[PDB]
Design a binder for this molecule. Structure first.
Ligand SMILES: [Mg+2]
Ligand SMILES: [Mg+2]
Ligand SMILES: [Mg+2]
Ligand SMILES: [Mg+2]
Lengths: 100, 57, 233, 102, 118
RNA sequence: CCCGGUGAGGCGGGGGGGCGAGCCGGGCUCUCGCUUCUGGCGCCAAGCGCCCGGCCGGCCGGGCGCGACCCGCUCCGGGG
RNA sequence: CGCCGUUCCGAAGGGACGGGCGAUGGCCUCCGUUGCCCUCAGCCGAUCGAAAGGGAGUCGGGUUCAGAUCCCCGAAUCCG
């Protein structure tokens, strides 16, 4: 049709898609952290993931801060055996998409 | 009287009958009427001495 | 006859002289975020070097060709909601005792019949919100040799059909009488979009600094031009 | 070891300033058209002693060039300032004591 | 229409009124603080008999949620006697004793004679 | 992207007005555009032009422009 | 889970006088009502925080086995 927008959204390193992904990311970075979108930004990826364009279906856009999960402990001091002295380089077990 | 007692008294019990009555002293009234008329007067002198200069020059 | 009472009292609006009047400040207002956002997103489309694939939507159909276009696209509007019923009735009493050629709406249908070479002219709305839906149609038309043209307004392309907005519109077939008008448009369109596609695929948009900051450069350059203009003698 | 007294000062709750009886942040007059192309004249209503501060403050009183209102401002008093003195501010202000100019 | 002030304030729009399509609760709840529930019984103690005899009052143990207004207007319904004033106090027991002082012409001793307490 | 300020209040160009260097009334460089003797007052328009609306050119009462230059893509600045 | 934050990245006022339009109740006279625009409006942060801070206005005499500036009598007083 959708198969053109699909193969287009795979050249994210191109010129047009690196301009669009950048003006989109700039505009998204100015709105709230969790706000309702009027319509699906990617209508194809939305159909593929189950979005029928009918009443009741809602699209929320949401932003999440990148990076790992620093351990929530006082200054350093995770009292335990040296195995669990790790705070900085830890990673979270759920993807940022699952947190969105 | 206390502030909230002023609702009881009559206006004559709260102001003296004069311009700026009961919100400014008489000495600074006469000594403000003076400065008002005098400054506007000098503003007139300077207004005159402006076009008096522009006449010759 | 003049009255000696009506004096003329002019005010002096100098610095510290008298209270400034209720002037106009539509430039200095603090706007809401959504207003300031869209007002300074329209500027990024003037500062950023816009690739020619998105920039090819600014060079749009003129104001004289647009009228005649929608004049021809008014004889081939789809049927309404009431005409849909009244055709089921005139088909009923037809049963008791051809389909006309019309417009064709939607990207998924225009693209699928531009590949089938069924179209004779394609109109594309110049301001599709996610532009990815019509980024490819220009090149797919040029490739298939279909006469396409970009029209200003997906809310005016959307009045042909009876919906809020439309994206594309296609003339597949036309009646006899209007085939001349269609051939008098396909000419003036193909010579403007398909013929110069080489020079459309190369033309980057945007990349233009704000006037406040182009005057600071035109002034400095002027000083260094009037330098050689005055030091030579 | 216990958090040293030096470290215990960044949290606060004891080491916060005593800003109870202070009269306000002593700041210059904000920049407007007048202060940017001419001069604006104000008077000195009084000179007060701000607590916990060696310098004195001076309530300079201008009038808003856009509304009918008398704006007060808390400057730090230059030396030689007295009450009823006239303080001018802006680019075209003359150069004497207490006369803020670029 | 020029912007005279540099502050874009939100424009006032229109606000309708509730025109429900069905009342939530079917029927208005009956007033459970009736004129009868608001007065339980009197007192027959020589601390209140000197009030009736001397002060020309009556002493009722009224409901605790009752105002001096509800009491006044609830003795002027159950007993048809205009009332001079009402003085309430919540006992350590928990009930709200109320000293009702009758109009000058009405005689407490003779309106307590009627209702029973005498 | 960051910072400061403000009730994001006159920013950038252009025009219009006055003073002086100059060429011989006309084009440019300039600059300014109205507040410095005093512990006063200062808004919510005077004025000229234009139109309309009721009662008898005349009473009454409204609106628009100038006054208060036009045009602009970031509120101004400072970083980057 | 929530925490931070209290004017800070905010379309943060549901108000007022006058006027114009509309309706209503009655000496439908003349006020009052509420609907719609026009005009005007700063603020500075929802709310909580003191029975010793701020905070209008009650005193005399009598009386009970236990309550009185609180009940009774008599004199006032503030707010609406
Ligand atoms: Mg785990
Ligand atoms: Mg409280
Ligand atoms: Mg208290
Ligand atoms: Mg107290």
């Amino acid at each position: 049709g959708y198969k053109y927008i699909q193969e287009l959204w795979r050249k994210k390193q191109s010129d047009v898609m690196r301009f669009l992904l950048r003006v989109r990311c700039w505009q998204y970075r100015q709105l709230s952290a969790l706000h309702r979108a009027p319509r699906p930004t990617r209508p194809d990826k939305a159909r593929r993931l189950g979005y029928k364009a009918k009443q009741g279906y809602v699209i929320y856009r949401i932003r999440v801060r990148r990076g790992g999960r620093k351990r929530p402990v006082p200054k350093g001091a995770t009292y335990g055996k040296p195995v669990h002295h790790g705070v900085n380089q830890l990673k979270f077990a759920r993807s940022l998409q699952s947190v969105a | 009287v206390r502030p909230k007692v002023l609702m009881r008294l009559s206006k004559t019990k709260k102001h003296v009958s004069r311009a700026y009555g009961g919100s400014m002293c008489a000495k600074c009234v006469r000594d403000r009427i003076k400065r008002a008329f005098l400054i506007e007067e000098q503003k007139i002198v300077v207004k005159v001495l402006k076009a008096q200069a522009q006449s010759q020059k | 006859v003049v009255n000696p009472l009506f004096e003329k009292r002019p005010k002096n609006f100098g610095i510290g002289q008298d209270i400034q009047p209720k002037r106009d400040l539509t430039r200095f207002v603090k706007w809401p975020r959504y207003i300031r956002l869209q007002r300074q997103r329209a500027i990024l489309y003037k500062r950023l070097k816009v690739p020619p694939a998105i920039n090819q939507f600014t060079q749009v159909l003129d104001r004289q060709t647009a009228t005649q276009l929608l004049k021809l696209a008014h004889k081939y509007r789809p049927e309404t909601k009431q005409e849909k019923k009244q055709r089921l009735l005139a088909r009923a009493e037809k049963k008791a005792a051809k389909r006309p050629p019309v417009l064709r709406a939607g990207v998924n249908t225009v693209t699928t019949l531009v590949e089938n070479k069924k179209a004779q002219l394609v109109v594309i709305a110049h301001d599709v919100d996610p532009i990815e839906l019509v980024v490819f149609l220009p090149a797919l038309c040029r490739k298939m040799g279909v006469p396409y043209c970009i029209l200003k307004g997906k809310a005016r392309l959307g009045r042909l059909v009876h919906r809020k907005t439309c994206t594309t519109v296609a003339f597949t077939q036309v009646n006899s009488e209007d085939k001349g008008a269609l051939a008098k448009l396909v000419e003036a369109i193909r010579t403007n979009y398909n013929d110069r596609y080489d020079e459309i695929r190369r033309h980057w948009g945007g990349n233009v600094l704000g006037p406040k900051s182009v005057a600071r450069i035109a002034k400095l350059e002027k000083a260094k031009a009037k330098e050689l203009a005055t030091k030579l003698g | 070891g216990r958090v040293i007294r030096g470290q215990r000062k960044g949290a606060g709750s004891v080491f916060r300033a005593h800003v109870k009886h202070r009269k306000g942040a002593a700041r210059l007059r904000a920049v407007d058209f007048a202060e940017r192309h001419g001069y604006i004249k104000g008077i000195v209503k009084d000179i007060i002693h701000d607590p916990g501060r060696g310098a004195p403050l001076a309530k300079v009183v201008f009038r808003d060039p856009y509304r009918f209102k008398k704006r007060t401002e808390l400057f730090i008093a230059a030396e030689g300032i007295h009450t009823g003195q006239f303080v001018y501010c802006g680019k075209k202000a003359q150069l004497n004591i207490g006369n803020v100019l670029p | 229409k020029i912007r005279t002030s540099p502050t874009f304030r939100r424009p006032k729009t229109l606000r309708l009124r509730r025109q429900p399509k069905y009342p939530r609760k079917s029927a208005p709840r009956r007033n459970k603080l009736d004129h009868y529930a608001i007065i339980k019984f009197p007192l027959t103690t020589e601390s209140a008999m000197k009030k009736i005899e001397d002060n020309n009052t009556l002493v009722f143990i009224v409901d605790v949620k009752a105002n001096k207004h509800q009491i006044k207007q609830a003795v002027k319904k159950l007993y048809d006697i205009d009332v001079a004033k009402v003085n309430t106090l919540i006992r350590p027991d928990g009930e709200k004793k109320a000293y009702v002082r009758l109009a000058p012409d009405y005689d407490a001793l003779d309106v307590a004679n009627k209702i029973g307490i005498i």
